[PDB]
Amino acid sequence: VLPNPGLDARIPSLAELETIEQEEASSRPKWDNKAQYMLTCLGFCVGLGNVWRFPYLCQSHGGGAFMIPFLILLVLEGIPLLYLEFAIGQRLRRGSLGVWSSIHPALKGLGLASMLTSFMVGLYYNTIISWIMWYLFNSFQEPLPWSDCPLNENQTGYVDECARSSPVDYFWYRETLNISTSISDSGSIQWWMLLCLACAWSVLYMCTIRGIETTGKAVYITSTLPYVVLTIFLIRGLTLKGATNGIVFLFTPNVTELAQPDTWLDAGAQVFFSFSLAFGGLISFSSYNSVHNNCEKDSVIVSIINGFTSVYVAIVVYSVIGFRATQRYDDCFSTNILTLINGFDLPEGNVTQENFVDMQQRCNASDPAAYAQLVFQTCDINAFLSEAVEGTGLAFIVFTEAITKMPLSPLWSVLFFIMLFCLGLSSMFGNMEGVVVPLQDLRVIPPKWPKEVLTGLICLGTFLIGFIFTLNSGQYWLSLLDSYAGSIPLLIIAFCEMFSVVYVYGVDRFNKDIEFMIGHKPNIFWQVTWRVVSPLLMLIIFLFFFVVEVSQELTYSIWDPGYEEFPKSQKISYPNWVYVVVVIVAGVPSLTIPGYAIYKLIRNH
Amino acid sequence: LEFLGIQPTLGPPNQPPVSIWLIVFGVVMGVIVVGIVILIFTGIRDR
Ligand SMILES: *[C@@H]1O[C@H](CO)[C@@H](O[C@@H]2O[C@H](CO)[C@@H](O)[C@H](O)[C@H]2NC(C)=O)[C@H](O)[C@H]1NC(C)=O
Numbered sequence: 001v002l003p004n005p006g007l008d009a010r011i012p013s014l015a016e017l018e019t020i021e022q023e024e025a026s027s028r029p030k031w032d033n034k035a036q037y038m039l040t041c042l043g044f045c046v047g048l049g050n051v052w053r054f055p056y057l058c059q060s061h062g063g064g065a066f067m068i069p070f071l072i073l074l075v076l077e078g079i080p081l082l083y084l085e086f087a088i089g090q091r092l093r094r095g096s097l098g099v100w101s102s103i104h105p106a107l108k109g110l111g112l113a114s115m116l117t118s119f120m121v122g123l124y125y126n127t128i129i130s131w132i133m134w135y136l137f138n139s140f141q142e143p144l145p146w147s148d149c150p151l152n153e154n155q156t157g158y159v160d161e162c163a164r165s166s167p168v169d170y171f172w173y174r175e176t177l178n179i180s181t182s183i184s185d186s187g188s189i190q191w192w193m194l195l196c197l198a199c200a201w202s203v204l205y206m207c208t209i210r211g212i213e214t215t216g217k218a219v220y221i222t223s224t225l226p227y228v229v230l231t232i233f234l235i236r237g238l239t240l241k242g243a244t245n246g247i248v249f250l251f252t253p254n255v256t257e258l259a260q261p262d263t264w265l266d267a268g269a270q271v272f273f274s275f276s277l278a279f280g281g282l283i284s285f286s287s288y289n290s291v292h293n294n295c296e297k298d299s300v301i302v303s304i305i306n307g308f309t310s311v312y313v314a315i316v317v318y319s320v321i322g323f324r325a326t327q328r329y330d331d332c333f334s335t336n337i338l339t340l341i342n343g344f345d346l347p348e349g350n351v352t353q354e355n356f357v358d359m360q361q362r363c364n365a366s367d368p369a370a371y372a373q374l375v376f377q378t379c380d381i382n383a384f385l386s387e388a389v390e391g392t393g394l395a396f397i398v399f400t401e402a403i404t405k406m407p408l409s410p411l412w413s414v415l416f417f418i419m420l421f422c423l424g425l426s427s428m429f430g431n432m433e434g435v436v437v438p439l440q441d442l443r444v445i446p447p448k449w450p451k452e453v454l455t456g457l458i459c460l461g462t463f464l465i466g467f468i469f470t471l472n473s474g475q476y477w478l479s480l481l482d483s484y485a486g487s488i489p490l491l492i493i494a495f496c497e498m499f500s501v502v503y504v505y506g507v508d509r510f511n512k513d514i515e516f517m518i519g520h521k522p523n524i525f526w527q528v529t530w531r532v533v534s535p536l537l538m539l540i541i542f543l544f545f546f547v548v549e550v551s552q553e554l555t556y557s558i559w560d561p562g563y564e565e566f567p568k569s570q571k572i573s574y575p576n577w578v579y580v581v582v583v584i585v586a587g588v589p590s591l592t593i594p595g596y597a598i599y600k601l602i603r604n605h
Numbered sequence: 606l607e608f609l610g611i612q613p614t615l616g617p618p619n620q621p622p623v624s625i626w627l628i629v630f631g632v633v634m635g636v637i638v639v640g641i642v643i644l645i646f647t648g649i650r651d652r
Pocket residue numbers: 361364365368
């Protein structure tokens with residue numbers, strides 16, 4: 001009903017907008033061609049959405065049809081709210097804290113909330129990009145370390161840890177991570193990891209030191225390289241033995257997985273993370289555009305590009321998974337043939353894949369008590385594809401071992417890690433601007449010490465706070481933080497977004513703005529979504545999440561070298577010592593929202 | 606050609622002498638420091 005008095009005294013009026021047109025240039029670096037602006041936006045969106053998130057356990061837990069709801073959920077939450085965003089910054093010529101400071105200053109809570117969310121996201125994406133570039137460093141050599149076990153001091157055999165497990169598994173978990181046996185124990189400083197993280201921070205600083213002007217120069221290649229590499233990796237993927245089995249595995253769904261509604265929750269959280277709304281970055285890009293700049297069509301163009309790139313990534317990754325499964329199945333069948341051949345002294349080349357069962361039963365029927373001691377393996381296809389990684393291994397302990405079975409292994413590994421580097425750089429650009437803009441807009445520092453040193457001090461702050469993940473057990477810490485990235489606070493600021501837009505800001509004003517700078521009166525579905533139907537879903541899914549989470553199943557996997565059937569999974573639940581951290585990391589913003597409102601109510605009303 | 610009781614033992618390889626990744630990181634760090642210094646010089650020079 002718009003109960004706010006003096007609603008116009010703070011928003012830039014139409015006459016003021018006309019006057020400020022084409023006269024202000026200081027502190028507001030004008031963009032180049034708007035196509036480059038969409039390029040940066042789409043690159044940041046795909047970079048944040050894809051790496052470490054889509055092919056993560058989100059993709060490999062549903063294992064197939066998981067993605068079908070997601071796309072639908074797109075049109076139920078992506079297009080509307082992204083249309084609600086991408087234009088507030090355009091109208092107000094300011095974002096971050098400006099939007100929620102200039103309108104209804106009583107709450108002003110989404111500002112610091114988005115600040116904290118972006119800082120949390122960056123704090124761990126820096127570790128992720130550090131690991132990616134460390135794996136890049138160890139390339140550029142024919143004998144890739146993740147290809148053969150290191151012989152121990154005996155000079156004739158491998159270590160038991162490397163022998164029982166895989167070579168690549170040992171290289172990731174021991175040579176690089178040096179992971180601990182629990183969370184309670186702390187290891188060394190892992191100097192090489194810290195040095196790599198320092199190099200990552202340095203290159204991120206170099207690629208953006210002055211703001212958008214430096215960012216755009218790098219974007220022209222950062223947002224285009226991965227796209228060119230994905231196609232060549234795909235076309236290499238099809239021309240592989242046993243491929244196109246993963247594709248038909250992905251296409252075929254199971255109904256029972258659709259029946260369980262946790263996949264709905266995961267798809268909603270994933271689309272919200274991927275499109276990167278309620279982050280402050282998009283409003284910050286949009287705050288430096290002309291008033292008459294088109295916004296409705298470029299938004300759907302970006303959305304379609306993101307939706308197609310997701311399908312492309314899924315197709316490539318499942319083609320590789322299918323190739324790996326076929327190779328493993330072939331090796332197992334060859335071993336099964338060889339054991340019978342050795343046991344029964346048959347000619348080599350008589351028992352093939354097509355005539356294995358009949359000969360296997362004929363040898364058994366010839367003479368019992370000699371076939372009995374033979375131990376056969378029951379490996380079968382459609383079960384090797386189902387084996388998925390619990391986390392972080394889909395690009396480190398799976399894709400590398402598939403690379404090692406291809407002709408140009410080092411160069412192809414280099415290209416793969418370069419594409420991951422580029423995507424991580426795009427995401428870091430977006431997050432870094434999204435956190436650094438509100439600090440400058442807050443005017444917490446005087447004109448002196450300009451942005452060149454402000455970015456330096458904030459980047460150093462991030463560098464010296466990110467030492468925790470460099471510890472031996474730090475990986476475990478990351479496991480407990482990523483699961484709280486798209487946590488409750490992000491959803492609550494999301495729920496705040498549109499009801500503040502539709503119940504505080506005049507929707508008629510927004511419509512008049514659309515007819516002013518865009519025209520093409522928005523369709524009925526747009527307003528009905530902006531008012532009702534669309535705002536409720538997230539509330540329902542949040543209530544469903546709250547109902548589900550009462551059945552706590554928190555548990556972090558452990559390497560556990562001192563453990564029988566060592567190449568397996570370890571369940572240890574969680575120590576209560578970190579439980580208080582959930583209190584620290586979650587629920588803080590709710591303390592600050594009502595304070596100013598109650599203070600004003602008791603001071604004036 | 607296996608003799609079923611005699612196993613090969615003299616096959617130890619060692620190709621990389623000293624940590625080529627160290628030299629790769631060194632050249633990357635050099636290139637990135639050059640970028641830092643040129644960017645800061647251009648920034649402080651542009652009035
Ligand atoms: C092959 O080895 C199995 C190992 O037991 C035996 O098969 C028996 O006969 C039929 C096979 O259809 C089964 O119902 C029995 O359970 C099997 N075990 C027995 C009787 O102890 C047998 O040595 C061989 N069977 C054939 C068909 O060659």
